[PDB]
Amino acid sequence: GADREVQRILLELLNQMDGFDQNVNVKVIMATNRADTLDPALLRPGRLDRKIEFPLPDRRQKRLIFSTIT
Amino acid sequence: KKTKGPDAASKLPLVTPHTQCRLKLLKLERIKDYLLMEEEFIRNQEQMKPLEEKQEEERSKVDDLRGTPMSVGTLEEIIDDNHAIVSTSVGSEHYVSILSFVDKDLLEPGCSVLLNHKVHAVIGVLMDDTDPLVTVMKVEKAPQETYADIGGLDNQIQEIKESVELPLTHPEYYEEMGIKPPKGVILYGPPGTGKTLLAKAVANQTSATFLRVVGSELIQKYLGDGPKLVRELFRVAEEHAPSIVFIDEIDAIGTKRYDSNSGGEREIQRTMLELLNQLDGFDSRGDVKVIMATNRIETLDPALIRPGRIDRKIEFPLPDEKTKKRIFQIHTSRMTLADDVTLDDLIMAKDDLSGADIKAICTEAGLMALRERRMKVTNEDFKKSKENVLYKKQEGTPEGLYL
Amino acid sequence: EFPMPNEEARARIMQIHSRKMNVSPDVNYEELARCTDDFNGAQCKAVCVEAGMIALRRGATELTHEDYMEGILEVQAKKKANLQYYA
Amino acid sequence: PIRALDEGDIALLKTYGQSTYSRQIKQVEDDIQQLLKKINELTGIKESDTGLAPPALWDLAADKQTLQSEQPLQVARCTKIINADSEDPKYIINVKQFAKFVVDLSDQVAPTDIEEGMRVGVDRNKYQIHIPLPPKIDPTVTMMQVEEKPDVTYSDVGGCKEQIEKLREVVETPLLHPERFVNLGIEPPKGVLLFGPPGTGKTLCARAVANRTDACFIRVIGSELVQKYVGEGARMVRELFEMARTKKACLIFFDEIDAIGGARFDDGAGGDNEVQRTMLELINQLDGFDPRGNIKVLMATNRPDTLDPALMRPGRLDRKIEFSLPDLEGRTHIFKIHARSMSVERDIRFELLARLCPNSTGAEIRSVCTEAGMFAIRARRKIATEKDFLEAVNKVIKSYAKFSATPRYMTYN
Amino acid sequence: SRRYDSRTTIFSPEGRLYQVEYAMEAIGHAGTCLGILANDGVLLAAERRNIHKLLDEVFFSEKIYKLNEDMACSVAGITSDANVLTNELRLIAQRYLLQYQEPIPCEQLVTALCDIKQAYTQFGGKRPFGVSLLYIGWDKHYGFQLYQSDPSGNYGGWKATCIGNNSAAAVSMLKQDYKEGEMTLKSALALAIKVLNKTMDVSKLSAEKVEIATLTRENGKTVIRVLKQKEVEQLIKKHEEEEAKAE
Amino acid sequence: SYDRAITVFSPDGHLFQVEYAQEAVKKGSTAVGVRGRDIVVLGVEKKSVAKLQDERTVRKICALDDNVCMAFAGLTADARIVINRARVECQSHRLTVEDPVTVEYITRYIASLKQRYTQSNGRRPFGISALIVGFDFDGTPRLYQTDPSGTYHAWKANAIGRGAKSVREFLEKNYTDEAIETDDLTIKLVIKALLEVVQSGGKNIELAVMRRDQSLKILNPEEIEKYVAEIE
Amino acid sequence: DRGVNTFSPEGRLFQVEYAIEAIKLGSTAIGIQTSEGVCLAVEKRITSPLMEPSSIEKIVEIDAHIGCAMSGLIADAKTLIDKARVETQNHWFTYNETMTVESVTQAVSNLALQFGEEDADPGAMSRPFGVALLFGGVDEKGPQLFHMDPSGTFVQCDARAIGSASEGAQSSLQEVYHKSMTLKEAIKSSLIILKQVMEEKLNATNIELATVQPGQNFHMFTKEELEEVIKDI
Amino acid sequence: LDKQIKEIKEVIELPVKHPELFEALGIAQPKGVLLYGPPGTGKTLLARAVAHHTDCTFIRVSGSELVQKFIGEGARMVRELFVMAREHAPSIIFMDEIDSIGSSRLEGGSGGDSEVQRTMLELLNQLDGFEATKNIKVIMATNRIDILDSALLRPGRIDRKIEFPPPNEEARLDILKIHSRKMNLTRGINLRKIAELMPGASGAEVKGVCTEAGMYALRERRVHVTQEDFEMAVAKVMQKDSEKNMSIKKLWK
Ligand SMILES: Nc1ncnc2c1ncn2[C@@H]1O[C@H](COP(=O)(O)OP(=O)(O)OP(=O)(O)O)[C@@H](O)[C@H]1O
Ligand SMILES: Nc1ncnc2c1ncn2[C@@H]1O[C@H](COP(=O)(O)OP(=O)(O)OP(=O)(O)O)[C@@H](O)[C@H]1O
Ligand SMILES: Nc1ncnc2c1ncn2[C@@H]1O[C@H](COP(=O)(O)OP(=O)(O)OP(=O)(O)O)[C@@H](O)[C@H]1O
Ligand SMILES: [Mg+2]
Ligand SMILES: [Mg+2]
C-alpha cells in the first residue's frame, strides 16, 4: 500500500492511451532510458508502438555533431 | 409519541403455493379484490359526506397570518414568554416575537423553528428535521424473504431470533429472570455464506423500524459531519419505537486504531469513537438493537466488539454437508428438474462450496439448459456448470508434504 | 533551552514544591532524585504532592521517605507487589 | 457449437410450458402492483405539517391579537458593543457576521442601562439601539449538563476497591471536606485519567460519580467539539470552561478523549489543523497563565499511548489510574453484583466461575451472567442452574467463539 | 548475532515451512525433466535449457549424472546446490558397496539422500537444498524403478513423472496417456517426446534442446546410455509424422 | 554450531513453536487407531492415489518392531526420521534388556525424543503426532498417542490429523465393549470413522491389523472393499 | 531480539516471569505436611473418556521416602523427575544413606535456571522449565514438604496448593490447616478443597492421591482406597 | 473469440431483451461479468462492441476515477453512479481495468491503503446488499485475476468469468484477415504462413504485423504491400528483449 499508487498511475496511463475512448487524434511520445524494465502492457502495440534506439554516437555521428556544434 | 413506524409494507400476505396453479389464481384474485374494494371505498367516501363547509375558517386565518415562503430557522436562548431569539441559516441572531399560534411547550433551544419571511416571528414548531441523508436509510418496502427461504442455519438463526424477535415477542420470558435481553449481534463469516440473507430475513418479520446502513456512507467529507450523521441516525432510532439498525460492512469504519499520521484516517477514527460512545457510553440506549455484518472479525478494533456492546458473536461458517443439500433443495425448487438430476451427488467433492456458489451453479445451470433448446434441466447441464461457475479459486498445500 | 532536570534540578524542585507539609527531616532527597529519572519537572509536583496524598490516606501526620518512594512508583502508574520469586 | 437463439425459438419457448392459468396470474400480479401505487398516492403522507399549538387553549387570543403583535414591535437584530464613547452619544457595534457600524441610542433606552459588552437590540433600516439582550448561554454548551442521576451506585461497581478510593480522593473528598487538605496543606490532586483494556468499568465509575456529585457534571460529547468552520471547536471549549467557572465545584468529564487529543504533526495535511487547535486550547485552559480554579477533569481512554504529551504530563492530569483486569476476589464480587437479580439456584458456587473466567473483564462477566439464563429460557425452565452458568462460560469466554486447540491437545496437565 | 539471523527453520503461524515451500517455488522455474518407467527399461528426458552458438559441448550430459553401475539421476535447481547432492549420492552408494559388497538398492539410496535433505530443513540455520531429483535404476529387489524427491526431503516412487518448468502440464498429459503395465521402452520414448513437445512452449524440439538417457538390463548387466543426436532427431521425425497423420 | 534459542516462552504462558507444529499435525491426513479386546487396528485416509504413484513407497503405517507398529499424521520427512530413531532404539533395548520392548517404553523414548527437540538450541519441533500400538509381553493390547509437545498418553482409541476431533467424537459415542466384541466389528468400526472424514471410501483408506502372535498385516484392497460393503 | 537472558526495567527476567505464569494453566495439586506424615492430592483433569486415566500420572515417586506432584508443562516435568531419581541413588551409592528432602529439592532446583544460549553447551537447555514441583517425604527431620517454582526457588511450606486453583486453594488451606492436624484430617481437608476447585464432580477416577509416612514408604492410593475417602468427604 | 462473445451476450443481452424466459425457467437473472486476459488479447474491444450494439445505456468507469482524495467522496460517487443507473432503466457498466478499486484488503493502520478499500466495500454492497438491484449489469475487465479480492470474485456478484486466451493459429488468421481488409494486398500474399510465423502472439501484435507492414510500404511511397514486407514486419514487431549475462540464466539448471 502507498506503493499501489504507482500501479494506479500506470493503469490510468494504460487506460487513457488505449481504452474505451479511442481518442485517435492525440499522439503520445515517451522517453525512458532502458526499456527492458517496463510494463509489457505499456510496451505492446496499440500503445507506445515504435521503439527507437538512441545509441551512443558512432565515429561518423561524432563528426557531424562536432561540426554542427562548433 | 415514539411512533413505532413499521416498514409500511406487507401488502402481500404471501401466496401460499408457488407452483402455477388455479389455487394461486384464486388467492391472488382475492388479494386484488380487497385492494379494489379499498380503493373504491376511499374514493367514494372522499366524494360523499358533504363536509364542504371545511377549511375551518380560523385555520384559514392562521395560514393567512403566516405568509408565503416561511423560512426554517434554529431557535435559540428564549428570552421572554412573548419573545425569543432565532438564528437563520446565515447564522444571524434576529430577535423575534413568538406569536400565539405556537405552543409555548415543544419549543426548546436547538429545535428548528418556523418563521415569517418579512417580519421574523416564530410562527410554528417543526419536529421533523431528520437529515435528508439519514431518512434515506429507513426500509419502507420490506425485502421479500422469509426464514424458510434461508436453510441449513438453524443454530445460527435461533441466536439472532433470540435477540431481534423474541425480546419484543414474549418479553415476559426475559423479565421473569431479570436478564436484560442481549443487544447487538455481529454476524461474521467467510464471503458468500449468508450474513446479508439473515439480515433480510430479520428485516421481513421485523415488527419494528429497520434502519439500513452501508458501512461507508457514514463516512463524510466535512470535519465533524461524520460523527454527526451517526448521532442523527441513532437519535432517529431512539425517537422511533423499537428498532434494529444493521450497520453492514462495519469493516469500513472499524480498523484497529493506531497512532496515525494522516487526516482522513483520523476523522474515520473519530467516527468509530462516536459509534462506540453512543452504542455503550454515558447515556443508556432504549429498545435499539444493532446488527453488524463483516467479512473479517479479526480487523475490527477491540472495542466495537466487546461483550457489553456487541454480544452473541455468530460464526457463520462455510456450509456443511447436510446444509448443502438443504440449500440446494431451497434453491432448485422452482425449476422443472428431470428425473435423473437428483442433487444428492453434486454435493461433496470440493470442500469449498458456499451458498453463493450453489446459487450460481443453479442459475448457470438453467442457462446451460437453454442451450440445447430445453426447459427441463439435465444431469449433464449440471455437470457442465461446476466447470464454469466454480473456477479461479486458490489451492493449498503441495501433495507429499503431508498425505 | 529548557533541558530535563538532571538530578540536582530534580532534588531542588522536589524541595521547592514542598515545604507546606509536615515533612520529617529524614528524607534523602538525593536518593529520591537517584530513583526518579527522566521525570520532567512538573512530574515532581505530581509526585511531591502524591506523597502527601498517600500520607493522608494511610492516616498519619508526617511525610516519610518510603511515602515519597511509593508516590514515585505511583506517579508512573506502576504497582509494587511482592513477587513470588527472588532467586 | 453454441448456436444462438432465434426469434422463433424464443417465441416457441415462451409457449410450450405449463401455463393453464399463468398469463392471467402475471396480469393480476401486475394489476396488484399498479394498484398499490394508486392506493398510496391517494392516501399519501399528510397530517405531518405540525407546529401549530391548538388554537383552542388560547383560541380567543389566537386571533387579531396576533396581528396586533405583528406590525408594531419591529423585529430587532442582535449585536454587541465594542465601545461607548463617553459623553458622546455615539456607540460602535459589531453585529455578528455582517459588519461593524456606528449607532445612535434610541430615546426609549437610557444610556446608563446600556454598557460596554452587553448585547443590544439594534433595529433594521437605521441601526438604532433598543431593549438590551441578556448574555448568551449557547444551546450546545448548555445541553451538556447531567441534569439527572444515572441508576448506578458505587456498590454495583465491583471488583475494584483501590481504584474507587483513588478516584474518590480527587472527585469527592477534596470538595466535600476541605478540612483534611488544610491541616496538612496538601493540594488536592486535580485531573484523573482512567486507562484500562477495552471494557473494565472505566465509564461505570464515571457514571457512579454522577450519582453523588452534588454539583455540575458536564459531559463533554467529544463529537460535538469538532465542527466544520474553523475556530468553532476552540470557541466551544472556551465556553465550556467559562460556564465551568460560574458555579461551585464543577466536574467536567471528557469521555473518550482520544477523539479530540492526539500526537501533533505537520506531515499529513498539516495534521488535523483544526482538531489540534482545539486540543491546544484545551491544554492552555487546563494549565497556563490563568489559574483555572475549582474545576476538575476526568478523562477515559482505551489506549493512553496515543495521547499528546502536553496532555499526559502532570498538571493537566495528575492522578493516572490503571484499571487492570479484576483479581479472583474481584471476579467473585462482580459475579455476585451482576447476579443478585437473577432467578438462580441457591447452590451455585460463584467462586468457581471466577477461576474459570481468567483474564476476563467486567463486560465479559456480564455477558456471562446474561446468556447464562438465556440457555435456561431456551430450555423453558424458570430457575437457571450451575450447569447452565458453566455452559455459558464455556460458550462465552476462554473458548468464546473459536477454540482451535482441541484435537488431541491435552499437553497441559 | 540475533539481529542478523534469518531464522530459516521456524514454523509459520499456520504450520508451514516457508523456506521449504519457497525452495519449491525456485524449483518451478528449472529445466524440464521427464522420467517414464517402462516394462523393459527406464528413461530420463531433460530439456537442455542452455543452448548458444558459443557454449562448447563438454561431459556426456549436462543434467544427467550417473551414480552407480545401475543407477542415474537428473537434477532441477541450482547446480551449486545440485552438484553438492550429486557428490554425496556417489559417496553414499560406494559406502554401501564397501560395507555389503552388493550394489545399494535404489530405495535405500534415495532414503539416504532424503535423510540429508530433511536434516537441512530441521536444524543448522542453513538454507534448504532447493533441488529436486528423479532417480532411475534397477535392483534385484524390485527391478526397474523411478523415484522423485523435493526440497522438503520427501520422496515417492512413480511409474512416470516430471519436475521443473511446466511440470503440471506434463503430469496431466502423462496421467491421461500413460498405459500402466503395458508400456514398452519405445512407447515410453514416444510418450516422452510428445510430453516434451507441448511442455516447451518456447519454440519446438530441435533435437538439441533435449537430452535423453535410457536404463536397460542387457546380458545380466545394467546399461545406461544417453541417446545421441541421430536417434533423438530420428525420434523427433517419427513424432512429427504421427502428428501429421492425426491431423 | 548454530545455537540460537528457537522455542522460547511467550506472555500469558505458552510456547508458540509447539502450537504451530500442532497445526502442522492437523493439516496432515486422518489416521485412526483403536484398541480391541485381542486386536489393535490402525487406518489411514489417502489424500490421492494419483493413478501413477507406486503405493509401495507411500506407506504411512510401519513396524518399529515385530510387536510394535505406529501411524502418524504430519510432515512426512519428520515422520521418517522419527521412525528410524525408534527402530534403532528398539534393537538397542533388545540388545541390553534381552527382551522385546514394551509399547509404553518405546512411547516414552519417542516422546522423550520430541521433548528434546522443542527445548533444544538451534532446532525445530517435530511436525508429527504418532499413534503407537503393540502387544506387550503379558499380551495386553496397548495404544499410545504422542503429540509434538512430547506428552504421551494411553488411549482406548483416538484420531490425529485432519478430521481428528469429529472422528473422535464419533469414536466417543460409538465406542463400546459391544463394538469391541468381535474383530470384524472393530475393523468396521474403524472404517465408518474414517468414512466420517474421507469421502470416497473403500478406495481412499488403507487399513492394517495387528494380532497377538501374528506380525503386522495390511488389508488388501479387496478386503477393504468387502468390509465397506458389509457396513453399507 | 530480546535474548532469553534479558533484564526488565524492574530488574525482572522476562522468561522466568512468563514460565511462572504458565503454571496457572496446569491442574490443581494439594500438599499438606503433618507430624504423622505428608499427603498429596491432585486433579487429573481427564480430557476425554476414551483416554485411559491410568496413563495420566500426576504423582510419582523419587525414592522410597520421597514423592512429587506436578503441574505445568508435564512434558517439562519428565526431565526434572529423572534428575531427582539419579541424584537420590547417587547419594545412596556414595554415602550409603538416604538424601533428605531439602537436599533432593536443592539438587533439583539447581537444575532449574541452569539455561543459556551462547557459550553454554552443545545442547544445553534454552528456556526455563514451566512446572511447579511439590516434593514431599520423610527424612531424619521428620515429614517435609517443599514447593518449587520455575524460578529455581524452593521453600519448605506447611500446606500449599499449586495449579490453576492455587489462589483459593491456598485460601481454603489457610482457614482449616493447623499445626497439630493428623494425616487423615489432612487427607480429607485436601480432598474437599480439590473438590471445590474442580468443576467436574469429584469421583474416584479423576484424582491421584498419595502419602508418605515415617513407617510406610511412598504410597499411591488405589481406586478402592480413593473411593472410601470420597465416600465420607 | 466467438464462444466468449456468445457467453457475454447470454448475460448482457438475453436477460434484458427477453426477461420472461428466465422467470419461466424459475432462475435468478445473472448479473456481472469479469474478463481475464493476457497483456492485450481483447477486452476493451468486446467492451466497445457491447456498447455499440446494445441499446441499454452504457456507463463507463475507468480504474483510477472513483478514487477521490477527500474522504468519502470515493463512495458517494459510486452510490450516485448506481442511483443514476437505476434512474436509467436497462444499463450496463464496464468498469475498465479494475485493479485500482480492487485487489485484496490489506491489514489497516498506517501501513497500507484504506480509503480505496472503503470504496471497494461500497461498490460491493451496492452490487449485492440489502437491496436487490434490478436490470443493472456490470462488466469488469482487469488483468491479473489472481490479485483481486475474494469478495468481488464471489459467484453471485461476478457470475461467469470469461477467460480470454491468447489467439490460436486459426484465430490469428482471422485477426489478420479482419485487420487487413483495407490494405491492397498483392498476389501471392499467403496469410497462412504469415500467421503461423507468429507463435504465442497477443492478438494485438497482429495489428503490429499488419500496420508496420504498411509503415514499411510508406517508405517506398508505394502501395501493394508484399510478402517480404510482411515477413520483415513480423521480425520487426515480435522482438522481445530476451536475456543476457548467461550467468543468471545459468543459475537454474
Ligand atoms: N445457506 C444458504 N441458504 C440459502 N441461500 C443461501 C445460503 N448461503 C447463501 N445463500 C444465498 O447466497 C446469495 C448471496 O447473498 P448472501 O446474502 O448469501 O451473501 P453474504 O453472505 O451476505 O455476502 P457478503 O460476504 O458479500 O456480505 C443470497 O441470495 C443467499 O440467498
Ligand atoms: N468491576 C465491575 N463490577 C461490576 N460491574 C462491572 C465491573 N466492570 C464492569 N462492569 C459492568 O460492565 C458494564 C459495561 O461497562 P461499560 O462498557 O459501560 O463501561 P467501561 O467498562 O468503562 O467501558 P468502555 O471502555 O466502553 O467505556 C457496566 O454496566 C458495569 O455494570
Ligand atoms: N481478436 C481480435 N481481433 C482483432 N483485434 C483484436 C483482437 N483482440 C484484440 N484486438 C485488438 O486489441 C486492441 C485493444 O487491446 P485490448 O483489447 O487487449 O485492451 P485491454 O483489454 O484494455 O488490454 P490491457 O489488458 O493491456 O489493459 C485493439 O486494437 C483491437 O483491435
Ligand atoms: Mg442493510
Ligand atoms: Mg467509556
Tab-separated table of N, CA, C and O in Angstrom, chain B residues 139-179:
chain	number	residue	atom	x	y	z
B	139	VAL	N	-36.061	1.387	5.772
B	139	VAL	CA	-36.631	0.435	4.830
B	139	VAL	C	-38.144	0.562	4.871
B	139	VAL	O	-38.770	0.368	5.920
B	140	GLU	N	-38.734	0.904	3.736
B	140	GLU	CA	-40.168	1.074	3.651
B	140	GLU	C	-40.813	0.139	2.646
B	140	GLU	O	-42.020	0.244	2.413
B	141	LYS	N	-40.051	-0.774	2.051
B	141	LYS	CA	-40.579	-1.800	1.158
B	141	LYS	C	-39.885	-3.087	1.571
B	141	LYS	O	-38.826	-3.423	1.038
B	142	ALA	N	-40.486	-3.805	2.507
B	142	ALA	CA	-39.779	-4.877	3.189
B	142	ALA	C	-39.260	-5.894	2.182
B	142	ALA	O	-40.036	-6.396	1.360
B	143	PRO	N	-37.973	-6.223	2.209
B	143	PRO	CA	-37.456	-7.205	1.260
B	143	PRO	C	-38.212	-8.513	1.383
B	143	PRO	O	-38.597	-8.931	2.474
B	144	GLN	N	-38.433	-9.153	0.238
B	144	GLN	CA	-39.291	-10.329	0.164
B	144	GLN	C	-38.461	-11.580	0.418
B	144	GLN	O	-37.947	-12.225	-0.494
B	145	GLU	N	-38.338	-11.928	1.694
B	145	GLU	CA	-37.724	-13.189	2.073
B	145	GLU	C	-38.234	-13.594	3.446
B	145	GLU	O	-38.678	-12.758	4.237
B	146	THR	N	-38.167	-14.889	3.724
B	146	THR	CA	-38.647	-15.443	4.976
B	146	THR	C	-37.616	-16.421	5.512
B	146	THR	O	-36.804	-16.970	4.767
B	147	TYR	N	-37.667	-16.653	6.822
B	147	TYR	CA	-36.684	-17.526	7.438
B	147	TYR	C	-36.644	-18.890	6.779
B	147	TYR	O	-35.608	-19.560	6.836
B	148	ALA	N	-37.740	-19.321	6.168
B	148	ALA	CA	-37.754	-20.564	5.423
B	148	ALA	C	-36.969	-20.483	4.126
B	148	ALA	O	-36.453	-21.509	3.672
B	149	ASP	N	-36.865	-19.305	3.520
B	149	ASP	CA	-36.046	-19.185	2.323
B	149	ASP	C	-34.601	-19.551	2.623
B	149	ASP	O	-33.966	-20.280	1.855
B	150	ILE	N	-34.063	-19.057	3.737
B	150	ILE	CA	-32.737	-19.469	4.171
B	150	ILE	C	-32.820	-20.869	4.750
B	150	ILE	O	-33.836	-21.259	5.339
B	151	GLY	N	-31.757	-21.638	4.584
B	151	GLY	CA	-31.739	-23.006	5.050
B	151	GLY	C	-30.394	-23.386	5.626
B	151	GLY	O	-29.373	-22.760	5.349
B	152	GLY	N	-30.413	-24.431	6.445
B	152	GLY	CA	-29.187	-25.001	6.952
B	152	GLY	C	-28.508	-24.194	8.025
B	152	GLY	O	-27.369	-24.501	8.389
B	153	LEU	N	-29.169	-23.174	8.551
B	153	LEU	CA	-28.581	-22.291	9.544
B	153	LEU	C	-29.468	-22.221	10.769
B	153	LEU	O	-29.764	-21.148	11.293
B	154	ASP	N	-29.909	-23.379	11.250
B	154	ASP	CA	-30.777	-23.389	12.418
B	154	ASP	C	-30.100	-22.700	13.591
B	154	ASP	O	-30.466	-21.581	13.963
B	155	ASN	N	-29.040	-23.308	14.111
B	155	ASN	CA	-28.392	-22.784	15.303
B	155	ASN	C	-28.008	-21.326	15.131
B	155	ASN	O	-28.139	-20.547	16.081
B	156	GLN	N	-27.570	-20.931	13.941
B	156	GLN	CA	-27.138	-19.567	13.691
B	156	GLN	C	-28.300	-18.624	13.420
B	156	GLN	O	-28.078	-17.419	13.283
B	157	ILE	N	-29.526	-19.136	13.346
B	157	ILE	CA	-30.696	-18.297	13.119
B	157	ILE	C	-31.429	-18.123	14.436
B	157	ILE	O	-31.979	-17.053	14.719
B	158	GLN	N	-31.451	-19.182	15.237
B	158	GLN	CA	-32.089	-19.094	16.540
B	158	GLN	C	-31.405	-18.040	17.392
B	158	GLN	O	-32.058	-17.329	18.167
B	159	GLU	N	-30.090	-17.902	17.240
B	159	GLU	CA	-29.370	-16.914	18.026
B	159	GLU	C	-29.824	-15.503	17.689
B	159	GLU	O	-30.053	-14.688	18.591
B	160	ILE	N	-29.968	-15.189	16.403
B	160	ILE	CA	-30.441	-13.857	16.051
B	160	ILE	C	-31.891	-13.686	16.451
B	160	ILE	O	-32.300	-12.599	16.876
B	161	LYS	N	-32.697	-14.733	16.312
B	161	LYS	CA	-34.097	-14.625	16.679
B	161	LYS	C	-34.269	-14.380	18.162
B	161	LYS	O	-35.272	-13.790	18.571
B	162	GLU	N	-33.317	-14.814	18.971
B	162	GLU	CA	-33.396	-14.615	20.405
B	162	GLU	C	-32.916	-13.241	20.831
B	162	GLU	O	-32.866	-12.964	22.033
B	163	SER	N	-32.561	-12.381	19.887
B	163	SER	CA	-32.177	-11.020	20.221
B	163	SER	C	-32.718	-9.980	19.255
B	163	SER	O	-32.373	-8.804	19.397
B	164	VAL	N	-33.531	-10.362	18.278
B	164	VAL	CA	-34.116	-9.378	17.380
B	164	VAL	C	-35.624	-9.552	17.301
B	164	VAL	O	-36.342	-8.622	16.925
B	165	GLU	N	-36.122	-10.736	17.643
B	165	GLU	CA	-37.552	-11.012	17.570
B	165	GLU	C	-38.165	-11.357	18.922
B	165	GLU	O	-39.096	-10.684	19.369
B	166	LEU	N	-37.669	-12.394	19.592
B	166	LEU	CA	-38.293	-12.819	20.841
B	166	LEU	C	-38.337	-11.717	21.884
B	166	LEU	O	-39.378	-11.580	22.550
B	167	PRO	N	-37.290	-10.921	22.085
B	167	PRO	CA	-37.330	-9.932	23.164
B	167	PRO	C	-38.503	-8.989	23.065
B	167	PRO	O	-38.949	-8.474	24.097
B	168	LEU	N	-39.020	-8.740	21.868
B	168	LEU	CA	-40.251	-7.986	21.727
B	168	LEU	C	-41.445	-8.857	21.387
B	168	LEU	O	-42.550	-8.329	21.240
B	169	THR	N	-41.256	-10.168	21.254
B	169	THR	CA	-42.389	-11.052	21.006
B	169	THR	C	-42.997	-11.538	22.312
B	169	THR	O	-44.200	-11.396	22.541
B	170	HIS	N	-42.182	-12.131	23.180
B	170	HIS	CA	-42.603	-12.520	24.524
B	170	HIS	C	-41.604	-11.947	25.514
B	170	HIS	O	-40.751	-12.675	26.039
B	171	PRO	N	-41.678	-10.651	25.814
B	171	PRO	CA	-40.706	-10.059	26.733
B	171	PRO	C	-40.863	-10.522	28.162
B	171	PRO	O	-39.949	-10.301	28.967
B	172	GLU	N	-41.983	-11.154	28.513
B	172	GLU	CA	-42.116	-11.701	29.855
B	172	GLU	C	-41.085	-12.787	30.103
B	172	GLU	O	-40.564	-12.912	31.219
B	173	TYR	N	-40.765	-13.566	29.069
B	173	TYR	CA	-39.787	-14.634	29.205
B	173	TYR	C	-38.476	-14.108	29.758
B	173	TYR	O	-37.754	-14.824	30.459
B	174	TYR	N	-38.136	-12.867	29.431
B	174	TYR	CA	-36.856	-12.320	29.847
B	174	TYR	C	-36.936	-11.705	31.235
B	174	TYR	O	-36.099	-11.988	32.100
B	175	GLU	N	-37.931	-10.859	31.466
B	175	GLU	CA	-38.046	-10.246	32.773
B	175	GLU	C	-38.227	-11.284	33.862
B	175	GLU	O	-37.746	-11.076	34.979
B	176	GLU	N	-38.875	-12.409	33.559
B	176	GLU	CA	-39.165	-13.372	34.613
B	176	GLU	C	-37.895	-13.761	35.344
B	176	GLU	O	-37.928	-14.099	36.532
B	177	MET	N	-36.758	-13.715	34.652
B	177	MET	CA	-35.468	-13.913	35.289
B	177	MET	C	-34.728	-12.611	35.546
B	177	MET	O	-33.863	-12.576	36.428
B	178	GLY	N	-35.042	-11.550	34.812
B	178	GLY	CA	-34.401	-10.270	35.012
B	178	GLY	C	-33.174	-10.029	34.159
B	178	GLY	O	-32.636	-8.918	34.179
B	179	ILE	N	-32.719	-11.032	33.416
B	179	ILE	CA	-31.630	-10.819	32.480
B	179	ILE	C	-32.076	-9.833	31.414
B	179	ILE	O	-33.134	-9.998	30.796
